[PDB]
Amino acid sequence: MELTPREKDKLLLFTAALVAERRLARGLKLNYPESVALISAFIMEGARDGKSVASLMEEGRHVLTREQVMEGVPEMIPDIQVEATFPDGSKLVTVHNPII
Amino acid sequence: MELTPREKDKLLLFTAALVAERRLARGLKLNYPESVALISAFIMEGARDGKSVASLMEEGRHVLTREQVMEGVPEMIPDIQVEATFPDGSKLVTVHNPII
Amino acid sequence: SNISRQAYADMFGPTVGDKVRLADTELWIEVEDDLTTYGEEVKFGGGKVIRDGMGQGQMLAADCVDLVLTNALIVDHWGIVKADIGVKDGRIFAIGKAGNPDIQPNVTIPIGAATEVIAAEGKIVTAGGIDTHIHWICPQQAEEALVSGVTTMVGGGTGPAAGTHATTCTPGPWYISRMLQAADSLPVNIGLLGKGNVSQPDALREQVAAGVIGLKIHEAWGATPAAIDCALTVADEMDIQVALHSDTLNESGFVEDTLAAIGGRTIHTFHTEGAGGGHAPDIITACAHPNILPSSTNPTLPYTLNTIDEHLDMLMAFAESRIRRETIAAEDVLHDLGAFSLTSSDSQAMGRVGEVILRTWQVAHRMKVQRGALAEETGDNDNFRVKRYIAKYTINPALTHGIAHEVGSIEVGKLADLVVWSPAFFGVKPATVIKGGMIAIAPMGDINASIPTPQPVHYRPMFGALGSARHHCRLTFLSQAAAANGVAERLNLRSAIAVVKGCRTVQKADMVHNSLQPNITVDAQTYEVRVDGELITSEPADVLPMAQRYFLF
Amino acid sequence: SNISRQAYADMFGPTVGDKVRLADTELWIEVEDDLTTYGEEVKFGGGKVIRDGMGQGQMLAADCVDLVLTNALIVDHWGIVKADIGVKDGRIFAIGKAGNPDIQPNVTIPIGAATEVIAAEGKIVTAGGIDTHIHWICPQQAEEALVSGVTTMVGGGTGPAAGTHATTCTPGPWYISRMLQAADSLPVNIGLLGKGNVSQPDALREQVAAGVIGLKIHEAWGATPAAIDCALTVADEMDIQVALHSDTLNESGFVEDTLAAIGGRTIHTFHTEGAGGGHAPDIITACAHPNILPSSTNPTLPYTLNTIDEHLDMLMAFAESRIRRETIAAEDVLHDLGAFSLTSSDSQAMGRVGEVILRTWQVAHRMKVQRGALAEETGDNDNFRVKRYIAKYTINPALTHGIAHEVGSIEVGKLADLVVWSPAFFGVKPATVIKGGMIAIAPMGDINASIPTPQPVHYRPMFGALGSARHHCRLTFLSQAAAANGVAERLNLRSAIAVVKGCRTVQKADMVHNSLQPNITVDAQTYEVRVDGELITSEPADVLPMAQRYFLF
Amino acid sequence: SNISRQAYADMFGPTVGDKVRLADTELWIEVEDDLTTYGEEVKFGGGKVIRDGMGQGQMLAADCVDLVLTNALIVDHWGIVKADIGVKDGRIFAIGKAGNPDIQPNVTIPIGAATEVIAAEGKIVTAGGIDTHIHWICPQQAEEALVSGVTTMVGGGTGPAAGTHATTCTPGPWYISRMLQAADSLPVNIGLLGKGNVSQPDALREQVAAGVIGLKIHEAWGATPAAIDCALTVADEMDIQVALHSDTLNESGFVEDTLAAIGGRTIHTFHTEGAGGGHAPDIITACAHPNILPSSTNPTLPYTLNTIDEHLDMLMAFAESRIRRETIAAEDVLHDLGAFSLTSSDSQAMGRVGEVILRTWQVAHRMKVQRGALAEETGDNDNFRVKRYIAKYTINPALTHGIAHEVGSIEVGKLADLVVWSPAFFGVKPATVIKGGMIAIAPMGDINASIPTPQPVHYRPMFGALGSARHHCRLTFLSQAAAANGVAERLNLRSAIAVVKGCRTVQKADMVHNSLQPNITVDAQTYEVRVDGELITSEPADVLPMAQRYFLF
Amino acid sequence: MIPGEYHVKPGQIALNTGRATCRVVVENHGDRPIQVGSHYHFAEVNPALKFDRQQAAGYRLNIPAGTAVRFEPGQKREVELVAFAGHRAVFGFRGEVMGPL
Ligand code: NI
Ligand code: NI
Ligand code: NI
Ligand code: NI
Ligand code: NI
Ligand code: NI
């Protein structure tokens, strides 16, 4: 695979999202790190699919709602940023106020 | 668990395969690292099951086909090698031209 | 005896006339020359050539090389040739024919009992990259850059502090000293830049005397004509380079005013296109001047579908005056023409530290696709374009910062910083990264495996990156003043030291394969870039090579 | 010109009269003072204040600070004020107004070309924590503690050995020497404790002369009156501190017998509540004495629903005599009253190394909820309670171990160990941890990203934690004897050295905001704790702040 | 007072007459002797024996040990006995009865204030393993080996280079110097091997003078009679060992020709069975000679169902002449008989670095199962077989390479490299690995936990592996010449140095419990191995102990 | 499109041009296989190989560098040799020359 440091680092984010994904499935209100991990992983997969940065900046705001997270969590996450390899190389996706 | 460095290293391969497994499920054509990770993990589980090295050397060539991976990927992987703990200890499994 | 060319290529790598595709791009290189004697090639292994009395001689250590890279396909600014590479005392000893003079003809690189072997047949060998726009935001950037094939990092910073987040500046003697000491722990050659924004020359001389090899003028600290002039005056005095990030706000004046302040003195303009900073919207016109060494940062290389969209937020009224589709499209072409001479990252401050090499090749690919062959190109290959582009991150950055006497290319006497690539992964994931004659990092499989190839294979630090071995295989660059004042002994630096020189005499005409000084203009309202009245533009890529086929994320 | 207070707060952080909630607790702090001159605040960035000739002056390095933390909200034992912090030569230079005297008024912290900037507007800055109950079971504890905001670790151990598993003791000259050498590799200040259990004074003097700054008397090695007396006699002679874990079994006598042996001499009683060790069931009565500096370990802080249940097995007839709901509930209140002066961990030996700060604030939260405002409190805020509690893990531990001349608070001349916090994550996850003027660790996003903020963001070591830079930014504390005998030169210690002093003269009255000596009693049968006949108790929390909202596991 | 033997065993570990199963194998050891005085055993803990005036005395540091391993069950080549182990100054001080002479009888290991304690009751303690066939392909191999229980690594290499991939050779003075410097960073004792393939003695003397403790003759560099003779001549001169990987191709001659070249001089034959290299198909006959010290690499140990299948590709006409079921089956038996004296890995070059100990025990298990008790065995236990096998990776490798004066067994005066095992995980996963008196690595649970046992528990480096502490607890072996020339001072090596001696005088008769010289023959066509005309063979295992019950992957 | 693919031009490469060569019939009289590498001094190969050693003096196999010729027991075959170059000084092997020629 010849995994570079950044590829291995992203594996950490992916695994953190798996934790969050299973807890959301149980019907738990997600906390701060779980929310950040879940939305971030969603975006990385979107980039793998070939979605545009513009499309993901919007879609990323509809992953979790205020009723699915603990109190105060939406305010602790003014935005989420993550980079992934799009068909046209690495791009930064910034999702503002992802949780409403 | 008293995990040794090699056990922890294999956890990295397992997690990389989870990424690939989910993308294949979505119907995406796998890239180079995803293919290597997926086939490798398959073999490690085969060893855990107790399959022989000879059996796995063949079965490993039927995990992914040329139509399930990106162009050029089959040629980038002349073979895949991975070791796992078989009932009779650690053994090396080499799968030649795993993708046809 | 005869052997078919295909069997030969499979055995010793390609030879004269053979072509190789660079990774998954449309770029093809053709072997221009082969320094071997057919039948006398050296190959290592059981029953092969490099053995006692055969390909290996009886000479003492002093009379043979420490390391030989066999059957390498060298890609450098001077040529694309097949040859053996000899390394001795951490430096490039010779490029030629390796073997034993006792029984072989034309041997120029003697192999003896003291010689280690790296089989390079079927591999491409290049010099290590040199990134001159590093923000020392975190030490982890060094490993990331090394893994990508970059062996020298020039920049400034003190860690994740506001000043460093925005500028490549290591402020003052105390921080300069601390960072020089920290440098001994990193597996790459390092040179530091101090804060050049001040109108008191002594405040600058102090920093140069402390160890910096250059001064960064950044608008965040005030890129005023007075500061610029002061920094250049000290630079001319102490033989150090000045890097510039001009007044984007046009607060103290327009681009012409800044150019006036520079007064024809040598200066390295960072991200000359403008998106990364500089007089809105015409800083790009700087590449027309003989005293300007222009470089680009990598987020704008090359122009793609998502470029503009991502740049707004990475930035965030002067946003739409700084981010311009017009100048971003022209930049790619200006690189292809040799108007822009270097590529750099701008690490974690609007730039990707591990994508300097990767993005340079993506631009070359896109330009070949859009513009076809270069006027200088001969034969049905892209050899010249490849030489022009590789120079952007190797020899040109070295010349610009006065370190070309040590690194920057595969030439005799230079430090042995080499990167070995498999053609299928060229510019993306290297097979071996050598620092000063020792392998510093390389992909490595299962540690407990019966062989080094079983999965998982990922980059892991090697012996060249360990303690004292590392110190012997890396270089900390100092200013002539610092070296003279005995800074190395005072701070007790353990790595090898090198001194910068020739920063003030280098000019645009000295940039290898990239010396064009175009009659370039920028429309103040439309932002359109024109060279000799002709519009300079290009189309955004929807998909690029060296991307999704190689990365897990 | 005018600006609304809300816009002002968003731009420069809160000012006088503004209140801030600490993380997700019910604790609110109110800015008591602001040392700025409205309109002259320094802000860094493009087009902002800190630029040549403007907020940045023309002074040489010697005449300006190396680092300035702009618009910081300082929370320390002496006050909660808004100000700029100047750092020079690794030490706190001044707390005041930063800028350029050439054009700005009231400048006390000069910013020059040699000045790095850390933007602290909207952030809370505190001194680094000091944990004095560390079991050196593994080196990984250092990074864990540093990440939590603890910059100094005092304790004993040799690794995962039975003796260390149970006691904070580094036995003998050989182990003491080896651990001092190992300390150079850790990014926190370190002081070691030797084994104080012996009735031959020379066996103790040897250890102090070897390097320990204190002696630990632990019942596992025999906390007998003879051993206690011997350790204290040597302590008085060599100016080192004694830490005590008394005879839980009441084998050699009861609590009064131990107190008798101590004979009014200065001593630091570890986990004074008792659960972590000590005369069953009244060791807690020690906090009534003037010569006792009492601390608590953290698993009992604060009293919650699961506390008792988990403690049985972490312990495992004398189990139910050691684990008492009565004393555990009273301990929280005694902290709120200032009867207990320090908090510590008791790392991996009935204590959590990364939860010293976190748990101290949870106790303050629970006490405010249950008891309301403190008698010393003025205004509608919890400023005094905050000052009382922060002192428990900063200045008080420093005073107790004779290192307050170097660390422990944000005061001029002290080592620049500072922790920057975002209000929403106060006491839980810091934004930046500074060791001796350099950032040692901080949360860091994708290394290859265009900016330092993209995910995944996790704590990674910075330049202040690397090789020689680390050595220059950390302190190894030695006893006066060791320093005199030249132990540092003999062992070739590379870090900065500091000497402990004033251990024997410190008393309960010297503990900042925690000098209460209550008339406390414990019922031998019921274990009920009473102060002046009044029952001291509290209710167990079912849910606590600084918990599930912040942690992934 | 009396106590049942079962309660006693649970409290202090087994005693004389008790048997213990080694992991999940069929091997049982029986305690041969117990050096304690029933009732006077030392146990550490609250209210236990090791306390002031009781089990701990009043002696000064010089008169007591630094570390005591209490109630250990020692398994070494000389015996399987229960005793306390005393360590002083990084070396084994004594094996006997620990305690305080003031109140206890028969004390030979004095415990004082300067004594640290490691509770070994119920644990098995062995010397650290010694692997003499290491390919320095990557530095990560050191941690892998250390975790498995190997504390000394002898081999050659420069990193992941072709030469090293195939041979255990560190070519020439430059690489030898760099690798010696790099060795200071690794937590294991190290000795290097140079390239012995040359017919000019001076080219060899240079390497020995540079630092290598041996020379490797590998067919890849030409294992010709001329090269072999030259290497042995220099070896006899400089007192260094020669390791051999003979001419598999029979190019320069057959096995008898190589044996003739050796001329009865001392030599260590690597992977004597043949699969890993050597004259096809009879290199195995070498074990009949008095001057040959034969070892096996581990992929062929033991013979199992998948052995042959995996070996073809790990190898890949001479494949089926090198991989032979006949010689592979015989090898196991030859080990059981003591004809083969050592086991090694052949790390990442047809060998598993972390499986040297594990595989040695699997062979012993399989041999007991197939052949029953050894002729030397007394009692209903496998004590002798255990002594014969443990010697293969401890004392015998040390004797073969002239380092037995420093390491190799638990004997007074030797470096304290010890491995503590829980019987259930013996040979698989150790509880504690001690390097020179300090714990270097051990399984460690949650760092932030209240105790060191909560999950996840995995191996993490301890204080003995950190910076200067590591340097003091490890040894770099040098040749007598290098030591004399002052190589350590020149390269500025920081670790402790040891010199090799006695390499030329060791012979087969000196191999502990493995001195058999059988009248062995190999059929040229069938490859059948016969000793005295009897066929030597064994059956392949389908399932083995120390495998799937312990590993996650 | 195949990443890093070659475009080798058709044809052949002539090896060791302009060097003296000679053919010799070799027979393996040993009971074990023998394999000889391209640059080994043929006159000093395993004694079990029967051939005119005198003619093979200063010669090696005229085959691609790094390759080898195998001789199974009893196998007889004719091989082409090419003369050593450089200083034509032979050192090593079975120690029969150890000097020029
Ligand atoms: Ni810039
Ligand atoms: Ni920049
Ligand atoms: Ni305690
Ligand atoms: Ni404790
Ligand atoms: Ni071998
Ligand atoms: Ni080997």
XYZ file of N, CA and C in Angstrom, chain C residues 6-106:
303
model
N 13.622 -6.264 -25.269
C 12.600 -6.399 -24.238
C 13.153 -7.163 -23.037
N 13.832 -8.278 -23.292
C 14.411 -9.076 -22.219
C 15.463 -8.246 -21.501
N 16.214 -7.469 -22.273
C 17.250 -6.610 -21.713
C 16.614 -5.605 -20.755
N 15.557 -4.934 -21.209
C 14.864 -3.936 -20.396
C 14.345 -4.531 -19.091
N 13.813 -5.746 -19.164
C 13.293 -6.421 -17.982
C 14.397 -6.767 -16.995
N 15.582 -7.047 -17.520
C 16.727 -7.430 -16.708
C 17.554 -6.276 -16.130
N 17.864 -5.276 -16.948
C 18.697 -4.171 -16.492
C 18.024 -2.815 -16.518
N 16.755 -2.773 -16.900
C 16.075 -1.498 -16.992
C 16.209 -1.035 -18.429
N 15.457 -0.014 -18.856
C 15.523 0.490 -20.232
C 16.876 1.073 -20.638
N 17.115 1.137 -21.942
C 18.354 1.694 -22.462
C 18.045 2.721 -23.547
N 19.087 3.234 -24.192
C 18.953 4.257 -25.233
C 17.829 4.011 -26.236
N 16.926 4.977 -26.349
C 15.823 4.864 -27.284
C 14.527 4.395 -26.658
N 14.620 3.737 -25.510
C 13.437 3.252 -24.820
C 12.753 4.422 -24.133
N 11.431 4.341 -24.027
C 10.620 5.376 -23.393
C 9.918 4.803 -22.160
N 9.662 5.659 -21.175
C 8.992 5.248 -19.942
C 7.927 6.286 -19.605
N 6.728 5.824 -19.258
C 5.641 6.720 -18.873
C 5.859 7.085 -17.405
N 5.744 8.365 -17.076
C 5.923 8.801 -15.698
C 4.604 8.615 -14.959
N 4.568 7.631 -14.063
C 3.374 7.318 -13.281
C 2.195 7.125 -14.240
N 1.038 7.694 -13.922
C -0.128 7.569 -14.787
C -0.406 8.847 -15.576
N 0.642 9.614 -15.852
C 0.488 10.847 -16.604
C 0.708 10.531 -18.081
N 0.633 11.563 -18.915
C 0.852 11.428 -20.346
C 2.283 11.829 -20.687
N 3.111 12.006 -19.666
C 4.497 12.398 -19.874
C 5.349 11.159 -20.114
N 6.156 11.207 -21.169
C 7.034 10.102 -21.527
C 8.462 10.597 -21.624
N 9.380 9.874 -21.001
C 10.785 10.235 -21.072
C 11.457 9.189 -21.943
N 12.524 9.588 -22.618
C 13.268 8.694 -23.482
C 14.717 8.685 -23.013
N 15.280 7.493 -22.835
C 16.667 7.368 -22.388
C 17.570 7.985 -23.451
N 18.259 9.053 -23.074
C 19.133 9.768 -23.990
C 20.504 9.143 -24.176
N 21.035 8.552 -23.113
C 22.359 7.948 -23.166
C 22.443 6.825 -22.137
N 23.383 5.913 -22.344
C 23.599 4.788 -21.445
C 25.115 4.673 -21.321
N 25.626 4.806 -20.103
C 27.069 4.759 -19.872
C 27.671 3.369 -19.667
N 26.882 2.326 -19.895
C 27.370 0.967 -19.711
C 28.088 0.413 -20.938
N 28.613 -0.794 -20.781
C 29.280 -1.531 -21.843
C 28.457 -2.806 -21.854
N 27.594 -2.953 -22.857
C 26.718 -4.120 -22.952
C 27.430 -5.445 -22.686
N 26.934 -6.162 -21.681
C 27.511 -7.433 -21.284
C 28.290 -7.292 -19.987
N 28.657 -6.060 -19.643
C 29.424 -5.797 -18.431
C 28.646 -5.107 -17.314
N 27.324 -5.108 -17.421
C 26.475 -4.487 -16.407
C 26.652 -5.229 -15.088
N 26.619 -4.501 -13.978
C 26.753 -5.135 -12.673
C 25.373 -5.370 -12.055
N 25.151 -6.596 -11.597
C 23.900 -6.991 -10.965
C 24.290 -7.725 -9.688
N 23.547 -7.486 -8.614
C 23.823 -8.110 -7.325
C 22.892 -9.282 -7.046
N 23.423 -10.322 -6.408
C 22.612 -11.477 -6.079
C 23.406 -12.763 -6.145
N 22.761 -13.855 -5.754
C 23.410 -15.148 -5.779
C 23.726 -15.526 -7.207
N 24.999 -15.806 -7.449
C 25.447 -16.199 -8.772
C 25.511 -15.058 -9.766
N 25.382 -13.828 -9.287
C 25.422 -12.691 -10.184
C 26.800 -12.047 -10.328
N 26.845 -10.807 -10.798
C 28.118 -10.139 -11.058
C 28.958 -9.606 -9.894
N 28.334 -8.898 -8.959
C 29.074 -8.300 -7.844
C 29.540 -9.293 -6.773
N 30.630 -9.994 -7.085
C 31.220 -10.990 -6.196
C 32.742 -10.899 -6.262
N 33.398 -11.353 -5.201
C 34.854 -11.331 -5.079
C 35.598 -11.793 -6.326
N 36.483 -10.938 -6.826
C 37.281 -11.275 -7.994
C 36.567 -11.067 -9.313
N 35.251 -10.934 -9.247
C 34.433 -10.728 -10.424
C 34.078 -9.244 -10.498
N 32.814 -8.890 -10.281
C 32.426 -7.490 -10.325
C 32.902 -6.701 -9.114
N 33.450 -7.402 -8.125
C 33.962 -6.776 -6.911
C 35.478 -6.983 -6.872
N 36.210 -5.884 -6.713
C 37.662 -5.926 -6.692
C 38.329 -6.143 -5.348
N 39.654 -6.002 -5.333
C 40.475 -6.190 -4.134
C 40.973 -4.881 -3.510
N 40.447 -3.748 -3.955
C 40.911 -2.472 -3.427
C 40.479 -2.160 -1.993
N 41.294 -1.377 -1.301
C 40.978 -0.964 0.063
C 39.855 0.072 0.029
N 39.220 0.305 1.177
C 38.099 1.246 1.299
C 38.333 2.595 0.639
N 39.529 3.133 0.821
C 39.866 4.435 0.268
C 39.797 4.466 -1.246
N 39.975 3.307 -1.866
C 39.986 3.219 -3.314
C 38.711 2.707 -3.965
N 37.619 2.671 -3.211
C 36.339 2.240 -3.751
C 35.223 3.045 -3.101
N 34.043 3.000 -3.707
C 32.898 3.736 -3.191
C 32.225 2.987 -2.048
N 31.494 3.721 -1.213
C 30.785 3.130 -0.082
C 29.473 2.535 -0.550
N 28.881 3.162 -1.555
C 27.600 2.721 -2.062
C 27.520 2.904 -3.564
N 26.906 1.943 -4.234
C 26.716 2.027 -5.663
C 25.253 1.732 -5.962
N 24.642 2.588 -6.776
C 23.264 2.393 -7.205
C 23.435 1.878 -8.625
N 23.132 0.599 -8.817
C 23.301 -0.055 -10.106
C 22.165 0.124 -11.111
N 22.539 0.356 -12.366
C 21.605 0.492 -13.481
C 20.473 1.477 -13.241
N 20.820 2.662 -12.766
C 19.821 3.679 -12.484
C 19.473 4.510 -13.713
N 18.220 4.938 -13.794
C 17.782 5.803 -14.878
C 17.693 7.184 -14.231
N 18.728 7.989 -14.442
C 18.797 9.328 -13.871
C 17.971 10.353 -14.629
N 17.166 11.103 -13.887
C 16.358 12.170 -14.455
C 16.799 13.408 -13.686
N 17.516 14.296 -14.362
C 18.005 15.513 -13.737
C 17.931 16.618 -14.780
N 18.178 17.851 -14.350
C 18.127 19.001 -15.249
C 19.094 18.916 -16.430
N 20.181 18.169 -16.254
C 21.201 18.032 -17.285
C 21.015 16.845 -18.226
N 20.138 15.916 -17.871
C 19.939 14.776 -18.736
C 19.122 13.656 -18.143
N 18.749 12.728 -19.015
C 17.975 11.546 -18.671
C 18.842 10.430 -19.243
N 19.737 9.919 -18.403
C 20.677 8.883 -18.810
C 20.699 7.679 -17.880
N 21.092 6.546 -18.441
C 21.196 5.291 -17.716
C 22.658 5.183 -17.272
N 22.890 4.919 -15.989
C 24.250 4.804 -15.465
C 24.277 4.287 -14.034
N 25.475 3.957 -13.561
C 25.667 3.502 -12.189
C 26.053 4.763 -11.434
N 25.634 4.860 -10.181
C 25.953 6.027 -9.367
C 26.820 5.585 -8.194
N 27.949 6.262 -8.011
C 28.849 5.945 -6.921
C 28.774 7.009 -5.839
N 28.691 6.573 -4.585
C 28.619 7.473 -3.438
C 29.759 7.147 -2.485
N 30.476 8.180 -2.062
C 31.598 8.002 -1.161
C 31.619 9.170 -0.177
N 31.812 8.859 1.099
C 31.843 9.862 2.163
C 30.580 10.718 2.229
N 29.439 10.114 1.909
C 28.175 10.828 1.951
C 27.927 11.722 0.750
N 28.841 11.717 -0.218
C 28.696 12.560 -1.401
C 28.753 11.815 -2.722
N 28.214 12.437 -3.763
C 28.198 11.828 -5.081
C 29.621 11.802 -5.592
N 30.133 10.589 -5.740
C 31.488 10.344 -6.198
C 31.622 10.372 -7.721
N 30.696 9.724 -8.422
C 30.743 9.677 -9.874
C 29.485 9.073 -10.472
N 29.255 9.377 -11.743
C 28.131 8.846 -12.501
C 28.844 8.176 -13.669
N 28.756 6.853 -13.758
C 29.444 6.164 -14.833
C 29.225 4.671 -14.895
N 30.320 3.922 -14.967
C 30.270 2.468 -15.063
C 30.964 1.847 -13.848
N 30.209 1.099 -13.053
C 30.749 0.482 -11.847
C 31.243 -0.933 -12.086
N 32.168 -1.380 -11.245
C 32.686 -2.724 -11.391
C 34.088 -2.914 -10.866
N 34.755 -3.932 -11.398
C 36.114 -4.291 -11.010
C 37.062 -4.122 -12.198
N 37.999 -3.170 -12.103
C 38.977 -2.888 -13.158
C 39.878 -4.074 -13.489
N 39.961 -5.038 -12.580
C 40.803 -6.205 -12.798
C 40.343 -7.080 -13.954
N 39.032 -7.162 -14.176
C 38.498 -8.007 -15.243
C 37.464 -7.332 -16.142
N 37.041 -6.127 -15.783
C 36.039 -5.419 -16.571
C 36.596 -4.171 -17.228
N 36.040 -3.805 -18.391
C 36.483 -2.614 -19.112
C 35.694 -1.375 -18.709
N 36.293 -0.212 -18.941
C 35.671 1.089 -18.701
C 35.119 1.380 -17.309
